[PDB]
């Protein structure tokens, strides 16, 4: 029966609420009253990197720390030289509306992915010179959203059909498919032990799934509206989203609560690209007015400002020894951020 | 600077003159995005002028035109939508004769209107299927007062310039059709962005010329308008 | 890949010929080009270059003046002229392959080369010949004048491998990366003045003479190779 399935649905959800209940027993901003919050943090722009035509909508760093690549909706992937701001591959695309784009941890492939329902993965490091496509991955049934290689093999999408997917490059096959959301999945990180993975999907949830087996595993309900973006702590045992609502949380994938709630009430804006520090102790997110902030994970501080674009940031991405921070915009601009001594 | 570093250098600038010569072409191009119902007939318009997005290409009087017809999308719009801010136009085509669809047309225009981020994009109506439209109240046998009450107090305006070979009911329906979306359009807007209505049928060819001239207008009004001579 | 050069086996003292090197199977226009040429029985010599573009030309010192070289990306052919022959040009000539960006593998592609007939850091190479027996792991040692180390971090050394009779192959860039389909065996390791090959297990296609270049500034300069000698 319809009737006595609802039921048994609420009784299960009213359960499950109980459950998070009870293992809260501290909280966060309780344990973080005494620890020493930190200084102002201002970082300079180092550098900035010119040549998109049109809005940059993704990018990401290279797992040496030194390349980036970058998608815009003019067509194009630059993979930059940031410390010389030079400019080593310019990859004319197929389809010009891409929504997120990857590079491959080996430094041989990238990604890229948007209106048209296809991550396309090109190979960087051919015998004839050029950069080429090496294949395009074909079923879904909406908008793709991010791409995040695993290995030079395996590859996992997440699409405006609420969906998201795990493929095997050398054939081209759903090897797994995910379908537990009901709204648009907007974001995808990776787990640093390459055996999770979370997304959320425009339905106030963000769901955590296990590479192998399958089956969602937990289903966070903490917000009010689409979440835009996700990022894995390093650890491993947390990850961050921001959403319309112009709220930060943080969720820990054990205690299945929200531990923080990241809100300054003159944000009015929303939340676009989220990513975190190596210690963890610094989670930068960007925001529809123009600027991305640097809040303070374990305090909970609006503790600096990123200020220099002239249009709305749409990602941001922190280097793998965490000693750049690069956000691109709306601005056509890409700006790389560094501490000054 | 050693000698690899210079090479470097040489061919990062050869790959700046390449996407200079790509800046002319895209400048040079204006892009729209066709919006519409399933039986609102947008392909017949297309036909004239997995795959999730479409595009076509067109050219009147040497100017570039990409019109991008959304595909195998899901219902919602309200992630995928932000992706066309900095675009010349939109285009919305309206079917004139599903009475009880029109107001389902309306509410789907109205948040297109006062999206944040089509804020500043006007959109060209073609209300198509207007031959379709004659046949419904010329045999009559449905009346839009029903479905719309304030069908009552309004009459044909003076403004009106209908071709000859119509029913003065025709045309006092058919400008009511048109003017409920420029109610809509004219309500928000701080005179940023309009509304620009035309008739359309199946036969009519000349919609590369209107969105060409609507397209002209667009831009002497935005530079006008930063030059405050409007 | 494949570059086949063309040119004359014979001609007197005093006089011009023109080399060609078409290209067949990569994307000619991105790549920088060479010239080496090698004595009958001596080493190889860098004798031009052309870069990506065609914007950036250097010239060895014997040569300055009355050689010439050239480039024609859309048919895919590198030019070398060689007015007023001397007899120190009864070489063998042949067009390498390189290209400059961050993490690029320079003088990838070595031509099979032309025969010719005619009727600055100073890099040693002294212990030209030893005898070599397969299992045994085998140090080649090359000498330079100046660092090879520059600010950025690179090192701009490279390997060669002339075997018998065929063309030399990149064995090892920046005297620490393996090129690509290189076997894991050969390694290799500096110093910033002195430098070294390692390869840990002679197989039967290991003999022939290795040449170790610098890539630091301009003229690029060999060593009198080493014979490894089964």
């Known amino acids: 029966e319809l009737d006595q399935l609802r039921q048994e649905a609420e009784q299960l959800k009213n359960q499950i609420r109980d459950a998070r209940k009870a293992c809260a027993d501290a909280t966060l901003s309780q344990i973080t009253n005494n620890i020493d919050p930190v200084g102002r943090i201002q970082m300079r722009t180092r550098r900035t990197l010119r040549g998109h035509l049109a809005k940059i909508y993704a990018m990401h760093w290279g797992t040496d720390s030194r390349l980036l690549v970058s998608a815009s909706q003019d067509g194009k992937l630059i993979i930059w030289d940031s410390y010389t701001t030079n400019k080593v591959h310019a990859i004319p695309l197929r389809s010009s509306w891409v929504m997120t784009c990857a590079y491959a941890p080996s430094g041989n492939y990238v990604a890229c992915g948007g209106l048209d329902n296809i991550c396309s993965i090109y190979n960087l490091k051919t015998r004839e010179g050029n950069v080429r496509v090496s294949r395009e991955l074909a079923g879904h049934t909406g908008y793709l959203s991010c791409c995040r290689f695993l290995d030079d093999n395996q590859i996992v999408t997440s699409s405006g059909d609420t969906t998201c997917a795990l493929w095997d490059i050398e054939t081209g096959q759903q090897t797994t498919t995910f379908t537990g959301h009901t709204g648009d999945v907007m974001s995808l990180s990776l787990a640093p032990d390459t055996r999770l993975f979370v997304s959320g999907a425009c339905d106030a949830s963000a769901k955590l799934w296990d590479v192998r087996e399958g089956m969602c595993r937990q289903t966070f309900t903490g917000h009010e509206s689409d979440i835009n973006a996700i990022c894995f702590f390093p650890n491993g045992n947390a990850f961050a989203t921001g959403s319309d609502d112009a709220t930060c949380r943080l969720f820990d994938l054990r205690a299945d609560q929200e531990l923080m709630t990241y809100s300054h009430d003159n944000i009015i804006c929303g939340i676009t690209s989220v990513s975190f520090s190596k210690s963890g102790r610094l989670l930068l997110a960007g925001y529809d007015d123009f600027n991305c902030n640097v809040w303070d994970a374990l305090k909970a501080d609006r503790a600096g400002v990123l200020a220099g674009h002239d249009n709305r940031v749409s990602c941001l991405g922190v280097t793998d020894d965490g000693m750049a921070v690069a956000t691109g915009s709306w601005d056509s601009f890409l700006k790389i951020w560094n501490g000054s001594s | 600077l050693s000698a690899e570093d210079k090479a470097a250098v040489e061919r990062s600038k050869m790959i700046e003159k390449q996407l200079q010569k790509d800046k002319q072409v895209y400048r040079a191009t204006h892009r729209l995005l066709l919006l519409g119902a399933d039986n609102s007939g947008k392909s017949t318009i297309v036909k004239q002028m997995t795959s999730g997005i479409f595009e076509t290409k067109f050219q009147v009087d040497k100017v570039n035109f990409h019109m991008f017809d959304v595909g195998a999308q899901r219902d919602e719009r309200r992630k995928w939508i932000q992706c066309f801010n900095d675009v010349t136009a939109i285009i919305f085509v309206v079917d004139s004769s599903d009475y009880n669809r029109l107001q389902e047309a309306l509410n789907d225009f109205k948040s297109i209107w006062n999206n944040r981020w089509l804020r500043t994009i006007s959109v060209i109506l073609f209300l198509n299927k207007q031959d379709l439209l004659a046949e419904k109240v010329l045999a009559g046998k449905s009346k839009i007062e029903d479905y719309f009450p304030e069908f009552a107090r309004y009459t044909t305006p003076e403004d009106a310039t209908p071709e000859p070979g119509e029913d003065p009911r025709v045309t006092r329906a058919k400008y009511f059709i048109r003017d409920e979306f420029l109610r809509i359009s004219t309500a928000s807007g701080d005179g940023r962005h309009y509304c620009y209505p035309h008739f359309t049928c199946s036969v009519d060819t000349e919609n590369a010329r209107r969105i060409f001239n609507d397209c002209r207008d667009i831009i002497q009004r935005m530079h006008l308008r930063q030059y405050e001579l409007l | 890949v494949q570059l086949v050069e063309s040119g004359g086996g014979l001609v007197q003292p005093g006089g011009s010929r023109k080399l060609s090197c078409s290209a067949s199977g990569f994307a000619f226009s991105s790549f920088g080009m060479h010239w080496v040429r090698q004595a009958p029985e001596k080493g190889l010599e860098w004798v031009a270059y052309?870069?990506?573009?065609?914007?950036?030309?250097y010239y060895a010192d014997t040569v300055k003046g009355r050689f010439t070289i050239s480039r024609d990306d859309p048919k895919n052919t590198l030019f070398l002229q060689m007015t007023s022959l001397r007899s120190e040009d009864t070489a063998m000539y042949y067009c390498?392959?390189?290209?400059?960006?961050?993490?690029?593998?320079?003088?990838?592609?070595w031509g099979q080369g032309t025969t010719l007939t005619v009727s600055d850091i100073v890099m040693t190479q002294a212990t030209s010949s030893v005898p070599v027996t397969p299992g045994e792991s085998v140090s080649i040692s090359c000498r330079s004048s100046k660092s090879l180390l520059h600010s950025n971090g690179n090192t701009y050394l490279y390997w060669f491998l002339q075997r018998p009779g065929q063309s030399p192959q990149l064995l090892i860039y920046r005297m620490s990366n393996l090129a690509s389909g290189v076997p894991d065996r050969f390694s290799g390791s500096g110093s910033g003045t002195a430098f070294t090959l390692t390869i840990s297990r002679l197989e039967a296609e290991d003999v022939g003479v290795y040449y170790c270049?610098?890539?630091?500034?301009?003229?690029?300069?060999f060593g009198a190779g080493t014979k490894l000698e089964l």
């Open positions: 052309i870069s990506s573009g065609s914007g950036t030309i």
């Open positions: 390498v392959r390189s290209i400059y960006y961050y993490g690029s593998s320079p003088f990838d592609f």
């Open positions: 270049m610098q890539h630091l500034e301009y003229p690029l300069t």
